[PDB]
């Protein structure tokens, strides 16, 4: 079910307070995904790579901040994060 490509979806685990509070209490994992990456493709990726029972994936697109570097203005890249809820069989 969409082999090879699934590996390119998940970029990194997200580190934050909101990310931490949703580990123990809500039983989810926040993580940075590819700008494409549908909820099915994230779920299916977590199901094989991380190998845990996924309840549901909620997804959102974060907009890049407009920073500075003296004169030349620059905008950061629009990355996409995925709150992935897990089932009772959880770990990481």
């Amino acid at each position: 079910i969409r082999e090879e490509r699934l590996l390119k979806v998940l970029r990194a685990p997200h580190v934050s307070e909101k990310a931490s509070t949703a580990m123990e209490k809500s039983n989810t994992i926040v993580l940075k995904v590819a700008k494409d990456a549908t909820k099915a493709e994230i779920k299916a990726a977590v199901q094989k790579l991380f190998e845990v029972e996924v309840e549901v994936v909620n997804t959102l697109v974060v907009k890049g901040k407009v920073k500075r570097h003296g004169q030349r203005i620059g905008r950061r890249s629009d990355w996409k994060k995925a709150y992935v809820t897990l089932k009772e069989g959880q770990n990481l």
Binding site: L7, L10, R11, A12, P13, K32, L49
Partner: peptide, 11 residues
């Protein structure tokens, strides 16, 4: 390799 190091680098 690629996935493992990509996940391990960010952590």
């Amino acid at each position: 390799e690629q996935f493992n190091l990509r996940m391990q680098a960010a952590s």
